[model samples]
Target: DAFRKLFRFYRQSRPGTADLGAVIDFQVVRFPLNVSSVTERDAERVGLEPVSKWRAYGLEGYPGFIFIPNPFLPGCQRHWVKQCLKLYSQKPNVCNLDKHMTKEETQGLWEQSKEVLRSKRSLLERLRWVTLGYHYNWDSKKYSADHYTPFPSDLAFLSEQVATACGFQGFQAEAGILNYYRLDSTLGIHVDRSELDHSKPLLSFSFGQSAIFLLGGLKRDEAPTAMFMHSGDIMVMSGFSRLLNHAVPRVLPHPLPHCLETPLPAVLPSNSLVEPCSVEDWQVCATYLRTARVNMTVRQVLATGQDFPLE
Candidate 1:
């Protein structure tokens, strides 16, 4: 039945058309291609020892998409979120529209106009994200910055591990964009195809508020499947599902779990400080996370011909 539907859908659809949501048999699609809540027992059973305590999800018969639940160390998530906010406060270009103004200058202008120019001012204020590694131009659909920043070492390492677990082997993490959202913020449906190579996977990590993510097919008009992106979740889009249209239609605020409710212990066996987060760091992370959501999406921007180092 699953094969019949797959065939029928391909036959009826155009050459480059996407597979519309159709009934697929779990047996035929090879359900549980990856394990969720991977335990030592499960890992030993498969002869692949567990890398971390988190669960893993991957498309078996399906072409793309892998979901990793709460994979990062408790302290690590706090470190990254604090780092993103710190970097963005220093250089606020992630959402600022003005091309000529320096990030600092843009903020000054935005503040001055807020009293009179309501709409434009609000638009500028909506700029609540930041990009590291290769900065992307939303307007040009390309990396327009003359220079690229180094990807965060800790995040880069974690992303590489995620790729390995998802079966991408030696996939590298070279670029990242951090999206910040207030309770009312929404990210429209779109595909990440601007990179030089679509063969590499795109990795996304969620923190703070939970969001309803809609993963759609190749085209925009078709309906998308909804999924919850909770704090500490990771998502990988690769192979055939790499260019799928996806969006965050809404953010739902919820009290953070006990692990995140307070700062992690300053000293522990597993604690290798990603960066020494201060008391202020906990305050900043906690305050925003009360009503905000942060998403970090990392990707490999270069194809095989490029000689850029992943480090």
Candidate 2:
């Protein structure tokens, strides 16, 4: 009722920006941090390759991006965020600290995140609940958010500010898809169809390194428009830009500021059980700061409407 009415009214009110017919605003913005060369190793972690799917509107880089605005559209944000923050704020008991077990002990956790993503089926559900370490993918037969670290709240907060600047009503974010890159870590070009809210906009936040974000039309075969999203910048894909196929062809080594060296506690791992041990464990962290690399996308995973797309 609200979204439909307001969206219509907003459109009627602003013909040029609200038309939802063409590419409206595009620009390059920089962040305060120069976290490009954060990582030194992982030869397979950098660069795009022929075998990789470098198409716009699809899979891309690491650490995971944060999604907002969409999460709150359906009221899941209040319920989900409250529950998650409560659980996450709980103190660390030894059981939870088991996340820090030895190589062989925690090998599963290490190996769990070894893969690039969670199961596609589970992705259809509330991925933020799973991605934030609040829940596990019982069906995915994997470690869920337990293995993969959650992004920082600071980043989430930043997305909210961006949404406000763009005139979005309220923001909600839940899922972050982390793509780790080395010389070999490359994401194929594909739309984020598994969990994102099809009805809402997609919010992408970049940290560390800088890359060309190529965007295309709604289909897999569409040609793309490219833009560079520097560190700490937010890219909102909504309205007509919703199903566009986007990809990162290759990341350019960006210069990061010293401030990035001190990881903002907001984005650090929050689950009591998880700990980012060893400077090496922050491998992607370093890569994001040092070499040109590291990116995460935040989004709101939407459920299908019971009726005709929720008028």
Candidate 3:
């Protein structure tokens, strides 16, 4: 209710610059995130099949690309974001330029870049979470056999769920990159082809903030289709459209959910033996997400029958 009024005012005030459609279409501007569930009606409105039927028809116009809205529960979304942040803070490539650096060193660079740009908010928030089962060598542009880390179990499970829901037979998550964003952040147009096999699909999950994503054709000259990627949205790129050129041109300052703005509840509905995240961790995550966006993309790095030893 409050968000809709504020959003409308923002758009009406800045007629030339504001984005009204992105805010309205996401349905988050006025609707409470937890209350509104993803139903067939919701999916069809966005040209998507229900979550169960994603295997039958991938996307409306695009064949291989699939978008599932609000796939993760509020609790699930909170857990993953906090977990990723905890890992990144412990060891912040978590960039380029400086190679591998501690959180402080990397943060120093982030501050410098922010100051140099003199932007409203840093394009990318500092300490963006980026990791891999088999770390890709940016300089060589290939996965290193000698360097490897155990795939995160929780993220692996999330990847499996997406694969199963999308009709993928077997998908192994071997590499991951988490991009944290603010209002001004923009992901450049590029194709992800570093993986050994293009046959496998790329699974992307979004939390915090909304974005205007441009899914372009194979060629750079082609015009791209602009779509909204709201919080808790899922994107899968497989088969024919696995390597399509895609970019995020804008991240909107749409209202975040009440769950996201405030600290996570002390206890979640399902009380598993092990909690997904601690209270302290959720505090850190919720604090960042209050004015931030987080995106995690999990992909299979090596093909089946490819032999590689873990470090």
Best-performing candidate as measured by lDDT:
1
Clashing pairs in 3: none
lDDT of 1 by residue, 1-311 (tens): 33222333333433222332232211122214333434444333222235554455544433667776665555556766776665443453344444555656655532343333334223333446677777777778876446576666666766666676676766677777888887778776578898887888998988887766656667765555555677777787888677887777656665354437645546533433255666755655576678678898988888767754454
In order of appearance, the predictions have TM-scores of 0.71, 0.44, 0.71
lDDT of 1 at 132: 71
Stretches of candidate 3 above 4 Å error? 1-19, 22-61, 92-125, 258-276, 307-311
Candidate 3 lDDT, 236-285, residue by residue in tens: 78775677777766566654654355333455435221235656556555
lDDT score, residue 253, model 1? 62
The window of 10 residues in a row where model 3 has the poorest summed lDDT is 27-36
RMSD of 3: 9.5
What lDDT does model 1 reach?
0.61
Q: Please list the residue runs of candidate 1 whose C-alpha ends up more than 4 Å from where it truly belongs after superposition.
A: 1-52, 58-62, 88-127, 268-273, 307-311
How do the residues 1-311 of candidate 2 rate in per-residue lDDT, one tens digit apiece?
Answer: 23223223322423233322232222323222212322211111111111121112222321122122121111112222222222332222112223453334432432233232222111111112124422223356222333334444644553444444344535555454434333223344656555434655566655445444556655755555445554444466655556666666545453253334434232322332122233333442343246444454556543344221322
**lDDT, model 3:** 0.59
2 or 3, greater by TM-score: 3
After best superposition, candidate 1 residue 26: deviation in angstroms? 18
